[PDB]
Specification:
Chain D: This is Mediator of RNA polymerase II transcription subunit 21. This is part of a larger assembly, with chains A (about 110 residues), B (about 130 residues), C (about 100 residues) and D (about 70 residues). Chain A is mainly alpha-helical and about 110 residues long. Chain A contains 3 helices and no strands. Chain B contains 5 helices and no strands. With about 100 residues, chain C is an all-alpha fold. Chain C contains 5 helices and no strands. The chains are: A mainly alpha (about 110), B mainly alpha (about 130), C mainly alpha (about 100), D mainly alpha (about 70). Chains A and B meet through helix 1, helix 2 and helix 3 of A and helix 1, helix 2, helix 3 and helix 4 of B.
Chain lengths: ~110, ~130, ~100, ~70
């Protein structure tokens, strides 16, 4: 039995979900700004489709890499915890010696 | 794995819709690009439901490599070398520590005999 | 003697015992066979690009390596209008725009 | 004189209790497990040979006995 952490990672439906939410917000914003002006709607639309296209490239990379996520890290997190557990005692061993001089008290 | 395969397949479908949509708006008939953008949004909604069905979960170097543009294969590789090197590190610390335990313990054994018998219990406890 | 085996308990060796081959215990030997620097046969299993060029190579087109966490911070279905959007995109004249490469 | 030597020996007992673990907690070696032992990257590991490490364990384990 090894401790299973929950933070430090984000789900996948969240990243794609707010992803396409942000993309639809972009289609609404550019959709409202292109109508008002003459040759900027074209290059602006190309910029939008290529930027969304490369963000979606990044998501293609994530989805392809995912082939669960939480289990593969907690082991190394615990192995990192144990080393610190080995290092935490030395400082107390140094503080004890400083605590012994106060109890220690020749005569002239 | 089938859910990842179908959501990845649809991901490729819609990114292909961005490809052919860009080529269509470069080499510009309305019905083709209108049906192409409705196919774009349909593929979007299938991204929604497909990934809601999938559901999979600096320390988070994965997304840092995705945004910066690096391959997480070296990430998980350095994680294999990190769990192996950390395993040999902790096991080595416990090995040298055991060498100190039985070394100093046997030194106290040859130091006094009346304390040898109990410290044997010490080296035989927690078993 | 005092404080001599006073916590009478079997504080066993830590359950994820590093004395055991933890890679084989947790079953991380397959992913090791997949991502290690050395293959199972013996040849160098490197030849991996520093970027994700293989997976954009699974796609088609030029992909120069060029936000999401901020979306994760502040997360139901967005809206859309079909007739208005179709009326918006119904404008693209056949004249060529400015200078941009098709590379 | 007679009262100071006890305090000095005690402080030396604590300083040996800490210094004896300091060397092992900083300089040590790995293990071959079942495949290999030394990692390709040994820059911050400063692995010492098992001979000098064992002899150092014997000396640090002997000084405390001498002081005792």
């Amino acid at each position: 039995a090894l401790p299973h952490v929950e933070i430090n990672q984000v789900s996948l439906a969240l990243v794609i979900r707010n992803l396409t939410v942000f993309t639809m917000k972009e289609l609404a914003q550019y959709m409202k700004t292109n109508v008002h002006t003459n040759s900027a709607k074209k290059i602006r639309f190309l910029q939008l489709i290529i930027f969304l296209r490369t963000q979606f490239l990044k998501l293609y990379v994530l989805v392809k890499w995912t082939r669960n996520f939480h289990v593969l890290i907690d082991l190394l997190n615990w192995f990192r915890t144990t080393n610190m557990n080995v290092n935490n005692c030395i400082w107390a061993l140094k503080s004890s010696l400083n605590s012994m001089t106060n109890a220690k008290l020749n005569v002239d | 794995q089938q859910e990842l395969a179908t959501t990845q397949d649809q991901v490729a479908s819609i990114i292909e819709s961005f490809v052919e949509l860009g080529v269509s708006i470069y080499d510009f008939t309305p019905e083709a690009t209108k049906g192409m953008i409705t196919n774009l949004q349909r593929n979007v909604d299938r991204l929604y439901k497909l990934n809601v069905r999938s559901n999979d979960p600096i320390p988070l170097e994965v997304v840092q490599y995705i945004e910066d543009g690096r391959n997480p294969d070296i990430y998980t590789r350095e994680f294999v070398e990190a769990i192996r090197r950390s395993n040999q590190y902790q096991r080595g610390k416990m090995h040298g520590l055991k060498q100190l335990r039985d070394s100093l313990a046997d030194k106290i054994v040859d130091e006094f005999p009346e304390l040898k018998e109990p410290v044997e219990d010490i080296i035989k406890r927690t078993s | 003697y005092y404080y001599y085996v006073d916590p009478e308990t079997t504080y066993t060796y830590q359950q994820p015992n590093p004395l055991q081959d933890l890679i084989s215990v947790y079953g991380l030997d397959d992913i090791s066979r997949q991502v290690a620097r050395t293959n199972l046969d013996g040849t160098k299993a490197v030849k991996l690009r520093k970027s994700y060029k293989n997976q954009i190579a699974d796609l088609s087109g030029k992909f120069s390596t060029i936000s999401e966490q901020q979306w994760r911070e502040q997360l139901q279905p967005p809206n859309f209008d079909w007739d208005l959007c179709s009326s918006v995109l119904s404008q693209f004249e056949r004249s060529y725009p400015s200078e941009f490469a098709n590379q | 004189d007679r009262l100071t030597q006890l305090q000095i020996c005690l402080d030396q007992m604590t300083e040996q209790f800490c210094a004896t673990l300091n060397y092992i907690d900083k300089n040590h070696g790995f293990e071959r497990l079942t495949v290999n032992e030394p990692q390709m990257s040994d820059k911050h590991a400063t692995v010492v040979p098992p001979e000098e490490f064992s002899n150092t364990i014997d000396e640090l384990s002997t000084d405390i006995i001498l002081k005792t």
